[PDB]
Paper text:
PRPP is synthesized by PRPP synthase (PRPS), which catalyzes the transfer of diphosphate from ATP to ribose-5-phosphate (R5P), thereby generating AMP and PRPP. Class I PRPP synthase is the most widely distributed in phylogeny, including E. coli and humans. Phosphate ion (Pi) is necessary to activate class I PRPS, while ADP, an allosteric inhibitor, competes with Pi and ATP at allosteric and active sites, respectively. In both models, PRPS hexamers are stacked in rows to form filamentous polymers.
Parallel to the two structures, we also solved another type A filament (type AAMP/ADP), which was formed under the conditions of AMP (2 mM)+ADP (2 mM). This structure is almost the same as the former type A filament model, but its allosteric site 2 is bound by AMP rather than ADP. In addition, the allosteric site 1 in type AAMP/ADP model is empty, supporting that the presence of ADP and Pi in the former type A filament model were due to spontaneous hydrolysis of ATP. According to our two type A filament models, the allosteric site 2 of E. coli PRPS may accommodate both AMP and ADP. The type AAMP/ADP filament model suggests that allosteric site 2 may favor AMP over ADP. Our model suggests that AMP/ADP at allosteric site 2 may contribute in the stabilization of the RF loop through the interaction between R102 and α-phosphate of ADP or AMP. Since the stabilization of the RF loop is expected to prevent ADP from entering allosteric site 1 and avoid the interference RF loop on ATP binding, we suspect that AMP/ADP at allosteric site 2 may enhance PRPS activity. The final average resolution of hexamer is estimated to be 2.6 Å.
Author numbering:
A (entry chain B), B (entry chain E), C (entry chain F), D (entry chain A), E (entry chain C), F (entry chain D): 3 to 196, 203 to 315
Write the structure that this text describes.
C-alpha cells in the first residue's frame, strides 16, 4: 500500500513523481495557522500503509523542516506502518563538524536526531554535501547521485577536448568522478589563497566544465569562471545539482562569463532566475520515481547507480 | 558560574533580566546564513558553567525554535555544565491532544522531545496554555503564573463591584483564580454555541474584567466584550499574559468597545500595536530575574507563587 | 490473529467483550504467589499474534497495574507481534501536574513510562481525566468518550426543560459537550469557595442533570445536589462514567437527595453499592468491542465518536 | 548534604539507621489516597542534595514498590542531585529467568527497568537471591552479605562439631561460604526427588546448622529439619536473612523440630511470629549505616565484606 | 524467507545446520583487511527477509564477537526484516557479577548491550553458564540444554550403578538434572578448600560420571578425576558441552586418569585434541536445526526440551 | 582528581604523557584470561574522580577495542565521575559510509555507539581520517591536528623551493593546509586511473613533500614517489601521522626511492621498521599532555591549534 504525501516545499516535483508512478498524491491539509505555526491534518486512512513523504528542506528552511517532522509525527500517531522520507535536498548539511573545536553546533546531526526521534524509518536523498551524513542516522540512508542526468546532458554538447574543473578543494571527488565518466578526460582544480586564485592543471585553449553540488550565491562559480577565462579557456559551462540561488545570485549570474548553467530540480526556481536566458533545468523525477518503486517492492537499490 | 545568553526573539527582555541580576549577557553570535539557515557561535568559555538561555518561541515561530535548539546543541558540545531554557512564551502549546482521534500531531510533545534530545536540563515558562505540558518533559518544568503582576495592576483601578469574566470555556480555571484573588468577587462565563453567545452569570451594571492567557487575533476577546456591553456592563477591561497579536489584531482592537487592554511583555510588540492608545504593557523582568536567581542558588522556587 | 487476555480486575467485562466479538478469552494463568507477588503464565502460542489485554487499573490499584505490566512483559518475551492494552479506567490519572512547583510526582507520566518500557504498542481508554495524557505516551492513544451511552439513557427520561450542571470547575468542558448533545439546553456550574457553594446560572424550577467523569467518595456530587435542591430544583440526576465508589460512598449516596445515579461498567460494583436502590448501571461492552474490532482490522477509529 | 527518607515498609529500621548516623529522617508525607493510590509529598528543599531512600519491597509488595518509584520520581522532579535506593530486601528477585522457555516474565528485570526509568543512580541491597541481578541494572549495585552478623551469632553457641546443611540445591554456595567461615567445617546438602529427601553427606550425631537466604513458608526448612532429625542429628538451628514468613509460616514453625530460628531485620515481623518463643532477631542497622556512610563520602565499599 | 549466514568461527557447524534444513548458506564475504580489521559485505538481497546468523564467540574471542556485531550492522542497514543470532557458545559469560563489589566489569552485560545496540531481535544459545544472562537482554533469549544428546550417549555405556559427580560447587544444578534423567541415580559433589578436595557422598566401587558445562584447561576435571580414583572409583567418564580446550588442555587430558571425554561441537576442535585417542565428539546440528525451524515458522519452542 | 590509566596498546606513550604531567599511571591490572578474553581489574579508589584512559585502537585492533570498552565499563560501575577516552589513533575510521548503497557496515558508527553505550563522556583523538566522525558521537570530540610537530620538523630541512604533493585525492585538504603553513608554497596532486598515475601540477626540478594521514602498506606512498621521480623531482620526503605499517610495508619502504619517512608515535613501531635506516619518529606526548591538562582544568582547548 504505497501512498505519497507532499509538503509545501516541492509540490510540483511531487506531482511529477506521482505521475511517473501512475498514482496520486494522498490527501493531507498542510498549512499555516494565523501566527505562522505549522498545521497538519491527514485526511485518509493510513493504518498499516507504506508512506512516502516528498519534501526538500529548502528555503524557507525552518518552516519546511518543521512541516516534515510534524507530518511524520501525525502519520506515526495515526498508526502508519513504515515511513520513508524522500528529501531531495537535505538542508543544513554544510554544518557537519567543528573545525578546530570551535564552539559551533553540528546541525546536520541535530536534524538527523530530530528525524530519528519523530519516527522516520528510511531516508532517501540526492547528492549529500558530505557522504558521511549517512552515518548520522540509525536508519538506512540511500544517497543517490545526480550525475547520470548531468552526464547525459554533457554528452550532448560536443565539446572540443573538454576539461573538468572543480571550483574549490571540496569538490575534487565529484569532479574526478565526472571526469572518469566523461570519456576519461583531464581534471583541473581551482585553489584560492589569502583573493588570488591558482589553477592546478592546464586549461589553455580547452572547453572547461565546472561541476559542483550546489550554487548558493554563485560567488565561487563566477570567480572560478573569471579565472578560467583569464587563463585562456574557450567556453565555460557550469553543472550543479541543487539550485539554491540565494542572495545576489541573479545579478552574479547575469554579469558573468559562464555560457550556460545547468541545474537539476531538487529546489524550485524563482521568477528572476527563470527570466535568465542562460540557466537551464533538468529533471530528477524519473530517477526518484524508480528509487521509490524499488524501495516499495523490496528490490535492490544498487541498480540506481548505473550510467 | 551563571551566564545568560539571548536569542533574537526577546533581546530587550533578556537585557532587562540581565540588568536586574547585575550581570551582562554572554557573548554569542546568533544570526542567519545567506539562505536563511540559523548560524550560532559561542564566543567565550562555558566549560562547567551554569547556562541560562532566554528566548520565547514567538513569531517567526520556527526560526526562533531552531535558534533555541541549535544554541543548546552548540553549548552542550562545548562542555557546558547545566543548561536551563527560560522560555517566557512556549509556542505550539495549543496543540496538546488529538480530539476524537483526528489524524493530527501533538506538536507540543514534539517540541518537548526535541528539547530533551538536544540536552536541556530544566525549563522555565510563564502561564502555559495547558498545565499538563509539564508532563511532556523528563526534566523539571517550572510553570510560573503571571497573575501577581496583573492583579497588582487590577487593584489600582478602583472598579465598582467588578465581576471577572472568562471569554471562553477553556479559561474558567484562570478566571476563578483571579476572582478569588480579587477580593473574592463573582464570576461569569461566556458560552458560544452553533454564532450566538450566552453568558452564564449576571453582568448587569457591573465593571467586567476579561482575563485570558493570550490574545492572538482578538476575535474571542472583542466578541465577548460586545456581548457584555449589549447585556449592559459599564466598563470592560481585558487582561492577558501573552501578546501574540497576529493577523487582523490591530484593526479588531481599534474598532472594539474594550476600554483598556493590559498585557505582559513575554512577546515584543509591533509598531501598529504600540501606536494604539488603549493597549498598555506590564513587565515580567523582575519575576523572571528572581526565578533565575533562585534556580541558580539551589533555593526553593515555591516563594515565586506568593501575592 | 486476534487474541484477548484478561486480568483479575475486570474479568466479567472482558467476558462480555469476548462474547460480542464471538471469540473466547485466551488461556493465561494470572494469580498471586504465597507472599502477594503477581504470578503470570501464558498457556498458548502467541508468536506473531495481535494481542489485546483488557484490564482497568482500579482498586486494588497497584496489584492491577503490576498484573498489567507483568502480562505485557511475559507476552513480549514470548515473541508476541503487537500488544494493545485496553484500559477502560486509567488509574493515577488525577496526578497530572505539579501545581505551584510542589514537590509531588506526576504519577500518570510514571505509569505511561512503565507501559512504554515493557513494550505496549497502543492504548485504548475511556474518558481520560485529562485529555493531555494522550501526550504522555509515544504510542497512539485512543480516548473514547462514554457520552453516547449516557446520552442515549438521558433521552429516555423525558425531563421537563432540563439543565446540565457540572459539580465543579474541572468538569465544565464535559458538561458543555453533554448540554450541546442534549437538544442544546442551558448549562450551570457549581463554584466552591473558602464551604459555601455558589451556582453560576439559573436552576429555579428545572430538572438538573449532574455530569461528571467519576464518583470517588460522592462528596462533590452529594454537596452539589444539596445546593441545587436548596436553590429550588425539581429533580436531580447524576451521570458519571467511572464508578470508583471508595471510602464512605455507600452512606453518602444513601443519605442524599439524588433521585437516580447512573454509571458505566468500567469498574465492577461492590455488594453494598449493588444493594442500593437508586444506583443503575449501563454497559460499555458494545462500544469497546467495536473499537477493538476496528483496531484489529486496520479500520478508521473516528466512527466511534458518532451519536 | 546527606538526607534520608523512609517509606512505609521499614520505618523502624530507617529510624535505627538514622540514629546510628546521628541524623534525622527527612520530612516527606508518604500515604494513601481514599481509593488506595500512593500519595507522596516532599516537604523540604532537596535541590542538589545527596538523597538516600530506605525501603524494602516486602509485603504488601506492589504498594511498597509503587511508593519507592513514586518517591524517586517526586525527588527527581524536585531537582535532587543523586538518588541512592537502599532496598534491604529486593522483592520479585526469585523470578530471574525463563526455565525451558516457558511463557513467564522475568519480573526482576522489569523492576530493575522501572527503577532505572524513574532515575535511580545507585542501588544497595542485602543478600540478593541471585547475584546476577547486579547485571540487570545500568547503575552500580552493591550486594552486601549478611553473613557477618549471622556468623558472629553462630560462634556464640558453642556447638559440638557442627555441620552446615543447605536445605536445597540452590543454597549450596551460601552454605559453603558459611562453612568456610565457621572454622572450616563439613557441609551436607538436602536433595529432594519425585517427596523423599536424600542427604548427601554424614549428619549422624552432629549439631546441624541450616542456612538459607529467606524463610517464606517454612516448608523446605521444616522438612529438612525433619529429615535431619530422622537421620539422627542432635540439634538443628536455622539461620536466614530475610524473614518473609508468609502463609502458614507461624503454624509450620510452631509444630516443628527446629530448636532455634535466627533471622535479620530486613522485613518487620508480625505479631504471631513475635509471639513464638524460638524465633530470634538480629539487626543490620549498623552494617547498613556504615555502607551508607561510605557511599556518601566517596570511600571504598570493599571494607564492608570483612569478618 | 529464511536465510542463513555464517561467520568464520563455526563454518562447518553452519554447513551441517544448513544441510539438515535443506537450504544453503547465504553469500556474504566476511574477512579481514590488511591490518586485522573485520571486513563484511553482503552479496545478495536481504530486504524484508528473516535472517539467521550462526557464530560462536569462541577463541579468538574478540575477532569473532566483532564479526558478529559488524554483520548484524551491515544486515540491518541493508533493510533486513528480522535478525536472529544463533550463538552456540556465548563467550564472556563467566563474568556475570561483581563479587564483593570488586572493581571489575560485568562483561556479559556489556556484550548483551552491544548486541541489543546493533539491532539483534532474538538470541538462541546452548547451555549458558548462568541462566540469568537471559535477563541481560531486552529481546527473547532461548537457552537450549544440550543434555538430550549427552544423555542419549550415556545410556549407551551400560554403566554398573553409576553415580553423577559435579566437579565443583557451581555445577550442582546441572549434575542434579542429569542424575534425575539417568534413571534417577545418586549424586556426589567435589568440594575444594584452602588444595585438598573433599567429596560429599559415597563413590566407593561405582562408575563415576563427571558432568560440566565447559572444559577450559581441564584443571578441575583432571583434579576431580584423581580424587575420585584415589577414593576408589572403578571408571570415570567426563561429559561436557563446550570444548574450549585452552592453554595446556592437551597435556592435562593426556596425562590423566579419565577413561573417556565426550563433548559437543559448539566449538571446533584443534589438531592436538583430535589426535587424542580418548576424546570423542557428539553433534548438535540436528537440535539447532529444529530450533531454527521452529523459530522461523512461529511454532512453539518448548518441544525442544523433551527427552 | 586527575587519574591516568593505560591499556596494552600504547603503554610507552602513556608513560611519556604521565611524565610530562608529573603524575603516575593509575594501578589497574589489564590482561588476558587463558582463552584470550580480556581481564580488567581496577586496583584503587576512583569514586568521583576524573579519569583519562589512553589507548589507541591499533593492531591487534579488536583486542585493543575490547580492552578499552571493558575498562570503561569497570570504571563506570566503580562510580567514576567523568571518563575521557584519549584515543590517539582511532581504528575502523576508514569505514565511514556506504558507497552506492553497497551492503557494507558503517563500522566507525558502530564503534562510536559502543563507546557511547559503555558510558564515555568525552573523546580526544589525533588526525581523524574523516572529520565528520565528530558527528558520530553524542559527546564532545576534540580532533587535534598533528601538523604542528610535522611542520616544525619540515622547516628544519632547508628544502629548495619545495612543493607539497598529496598521494591521492582524499588527502587534498590536508595537503593544502600544510602547503599554506609551509610558507605558502605550491601544491600538486597524484591522480590514479584505470594503473597509470597522472600528476596535476608541475613537479620538475623541485623537492617534493608527500603528506598523508597514515601509512598502512606503503602502496600509494611508494607508487607516488616513483611517479614523482620519473617526472623529475630532486628529493621526495614522506610525512605521515599514523604509522600502521601492515603487511609488506617493510619491504615496500626498503625497496623505494623515498629519501626519508617521518611519522608520529600514535602507534608503536615494530622491530623490522625500527631497523630501517630512513624511517624517523617524532613524538606527540607534549601535545597530548597539554590537551589533557586543558580538559582537566575547564580551560579552552582552542589554543591547541596554534603554530
Ligand atoms: N556522482 C558520483 N559518481 C560516482 N562517485 C561519486 C559521485 N560523487 C561522489 N562520488 C564518490 O567518489 C568515490 C568514487 O570511488 P570509485 O568507486 O573508486 O570511483 C566514492 O567515494 C563516491 O562516493
Ligand atoms: N463526551 C464528550 N463529547 C465531545 N467532546 C468532549 C467530550 N468530553 C470532552 N470533550 C472535549 O470537548 C471539546 C469539544 O469541542 P468541540 O469539537 O468544539 O465540541 C473537545 O476538546 C473534546 O475533547
Ligand atoms: N555470605 C557470603 N560470603 C561470601 N561469599 C558468598 C556469600 N554468599 C554468596 N557468596 C558467593 O560465594 C562465592 C565465594 O567465592 P570465594 O571468593 O572463592 O569464596 C562468591 O561467588 C560469592 O558471591
Ligand atoms: N540440562 C538440564 N536439564 C534440565 N534442567 C536444567 C539443565 N541444566 C540446568 N537446569 C536447571 O535445573 C532446574 C531444574 O528444575 P526442575 O524443573 O525442578 O527439574 C532449572 O532451574 C533448570 O534451568
Ligand atoms: N592539519 C590541518 N591544519 C589545518 N586544517 C586542517 C588540517 N587538516 C585538515 N584540515 C581542514 O582543512 C580546513 C581548513 O580550512 P581553513 O580554515 O579555511 O584553512 C578545515 O576543514 C580543517 O578541518
Ligand atoms: O555561494 P557559493 O559559496 O558560491 O556556493 C556554495 C558553495 O559552498 C560549498 O562549497 C558548496 O560546495 C558550494 O560550492
Ligand atoms: O485569536 P483568539 O482566538 O481570539 O485568541 C486566542 C484564544 O485561543 C485560546 O483559547 C486561547 O485561550 C485564546 O483565548
Ligand atoms: O470523591 P469526589 O471528590 O466527590 O469525586 C471525585 C472528583 O474528583 C475529580 O474532580 C473528579 O472529577 C471527581 O469529580
Ligand atoms: O517457603 P519456602 O519455599 O520453604 O522458602 C522459600 C525458599 O524458596 C527459595 O529457594 C529460597 O531459597 C527459600 O529457600
Ligand atoms: O579450566 P577449568 O577451570 O578446569 O574449566 C573451566 C571451569 O570454570 C567454570 O566453573 C566452568 O564451570 C568450568 O568447570
Ligand atoms: O596502504 P596504503 O593504501 O598505501 O595507505 C593507506 C592509505 O588509505 C587511505 O587513503 C589513507 O589515506 C592512506 O593513504
Ligand atoms: Mg564547494
Ligand atoms: Mg481561550
Ligand atoms: Mg471533578
Ligand atoms: Mg532455596
Ligand atoms: Mg560461575
Ligand atoms: Mg564449574
Ligand atoms: Mg589516502
Amino acid at each position: 500500500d504505497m501512498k505519497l504525501f507532499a509538503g509545501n516545499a516541492t509540490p510540483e516535483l511531487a506531482q511529477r513523481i506521482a505521475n511517473r508512478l501512475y498514482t496520486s498524491l494522498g490527501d493531507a491539509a498542510v498549512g499555516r495557522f494565523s501566527d505562522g505555526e505549522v498545521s497538519v491534518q491527514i485526511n485518509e486512512n493510513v493504518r498499516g500503509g507504506d508512506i512516502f513523504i516528498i519534501q526538500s528542506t529548502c528555503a524557507p528552511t525552518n518552516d519546511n523542516l518543521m512541516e516534515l517532522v510534524v507530518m511524520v509525527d501525525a502519520l506515526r500517531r495515526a498508526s502508519a506502518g513504515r515511513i520513508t522520507a524522500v528529501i531531495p535536498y537535505f538542508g543544513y548539511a554544510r554544518q557537519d563538524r567543528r573545525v578546530r573545536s570551535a564552539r559551533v553546533p553540528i546541525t546536520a546531526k541535530v536534524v538527523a536526531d530530530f528525524l530519528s526521534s519523530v519516527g522516520v524509518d528510511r531516508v532517501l536523498t540526492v547528492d549529500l554535501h558530505a557522504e558521511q551524513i549517512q552515518g548520522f542516522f540509525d536508519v538506512p540512508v540511500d544517497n543517490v547521485f545526480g550525475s547520470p542526468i548531468l552526464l547525459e546532458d554533457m554528452l550532448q554538447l560536443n565539446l572540443d577536448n573538454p576539461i573538468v574543473v572543480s571550483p574549490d578543494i571540496g569538490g575534487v571527488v565529484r569532479a574526478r568522478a565526472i571526469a572518469k565518466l566523461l570519456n576519461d578526460t583531464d581534471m583541473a582544480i581551482i585553489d584560492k589563497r589569502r583573493q588570488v586564485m591558482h589553477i592546478i592543471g592546464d586549461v589553455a585553449g580547452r572547453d572547461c566544465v565546472l561541476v559542483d553540488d550546489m550554487i548558493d550565491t554563485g560567488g565561487t562559480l563566477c570567480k572560478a569562471a573569471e579565472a578560467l577565462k583569464e587563463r585562456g579557456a574557450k567556453r565555460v559551462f557550469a553543472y550543479a545539482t541543487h539550485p539554491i540561488f540565494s542572495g545576489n545570485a541573479a545579478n552574479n549570474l547575469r554579469n558573468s562569463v559562464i555560457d550556460e548553467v545547468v541545474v537539476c530540480d531538487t529546489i524550485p526556481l524563482s521568477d528572476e532566475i527563470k527570466s535568465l536566458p542562460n540557466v537551464r533545468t533538468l529533471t530528477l523525477s524519473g530517477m526518484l520515481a524508480e528509487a521509490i518503486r524499488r524501495i516499495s517492492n523490496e528490490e535492490s537499490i544498487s541498480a540506481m547507480f548505473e550510467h
